[PDB]
């Protein structure tokens, strides 16, 4: 086993995987935001109902979406190139769908129903959530491939 | 001894990944803070729609409790994980304790920024957010050092 070269493959694969994990976590944060649709912080630490004031919550989801795109615009690794480009495209289609639906998602008093169509995966139509789901799938594929590359480099140490 | 070093690399990678996930959740709160008082515009910019921040803050709060849960699930890092976990609880509790300004209809931009906008020159949570950020940076640095040092062992003679 050429330990110098295996060392470099491990380092590079870890660096890709770290960047992918950061993007996956940012996607997870949008799922958390979706739990706050139509909600407020109560004194008892629960979320209480306060329907139909979701505009700045959705602006937060949008800002996170553009950060995801910026990370994917810079990230690279052989057989990851296509998966990264695909994820970057999906991330742009998500942001574009939100912007295109500004007349429902970017007004005073954005309704719970419209916010759910943008970012709540459990929503049953699409104002962004289908693009969010495709983005999640694209990142899962990228993660699986990045993890397999790291696992293969570590295995060469036998 | 490559079997022992491989284990150290895979375990250190796994810890580092878990730490980076938490740091990225904290990053998302910093991005939420950019949306205080804002709405999505047709041209892709954020436009002003002031003083409707309660559900945005409920989102930050939800993320903050997830941070604590992930830290609860995490060698050589015990003290730094415990510090980060405590800081994360203190941030969530500060938000909840400020419900009278952060959990009402029409939360103002000013009060939202005192909760989650770092370096806000105008405390309703930001100081706790900043302490949490520093505690996760210290944990991240330690986890990175443990991975880097394990990898460096591979080529030692
Ligand atoms: Cl559309
Ligand atoms: Cl974990
Ligand atoms: Cl008030």
Author numbering:
A (entry chain A): 40 to 116, 118 to 164, 167 to 200
B (entry chain B): 41 to 114, 118 to 165, 168 to 202
How do the authors describe this structure?
Outer surface protein C (OspC) plays a pivotal role in mediating tick-to-host transmission and infectivity of the Lyme disease spirochete, Borreliella burgdorferi. OspC is a helical-rich homodimer that interacts with tick salivary proteins, as well as components of the mammalian immune system. OspC consists of four long α-helices, two shorter α-helices (4 and 5), and two short antiparallel β-strands located between α1 and α2 (23, 24). The biologically functional molecule is a dimer (with monomers referred to here as OspC-OspC′) that assumes a knob-shaped structure anchored via an N-terminal lipidated moiety in the spirochete’s outer membrane.
To elucidate the structural basis for B5 IgG’s specificity for OspCA, we solved the crystal structures of recombinant OspCB and OspCK at 1.5-Å and 1.9-Å resolution, respectively, in the P21 space group. A deletion at residue 74 and an insertion of residue 165 in OspCB relative to OspCA and OspCK accounts for the greater structural deviation of OspCB to OspCA and OspCK, as exhibited by an RMSD of 0.9 Å for all atoms when the OspCB monomer was superposed onto OspCA or OspCK monomers. Superpositioning the B5-OspCA complex onto OspCB and OspCK revealed additional structural attributes that likely account for B5’s inability to recognize OspCB and OspCK. In OspCB and OspCK, Glu-175 is superposed with OspCA Gly-174. The bulkier and negatively charged Glu-175 side would be expected to clash (sterically and electrostatically) with Trp-100, thereby impeding B5 interaction. Furthermore, in the case of OspCB, an “insertion” of Ala-162 within loop 5-6 relative to OspCA alters the configuration of the loop, resulting in a theoretical clash of B5 with Tyr-47. OspCB is also unable to H-bond with B5 Tyr-47, due to an Ala rather than a Thr at position 162, as is the case in OspCA. Another structural feature in OspCB disfavoring B5 binding includes deletion of one residue immediately before Lys-74 in OspCB. This deletion substantially altered residue positions 73 to 75 within α-helix 1 of OspCB relative to the same residues in OspCA and OspCK. As a result, the superposed side chain of Lys-74 in OspCB clashes with B5 Tyr-102.
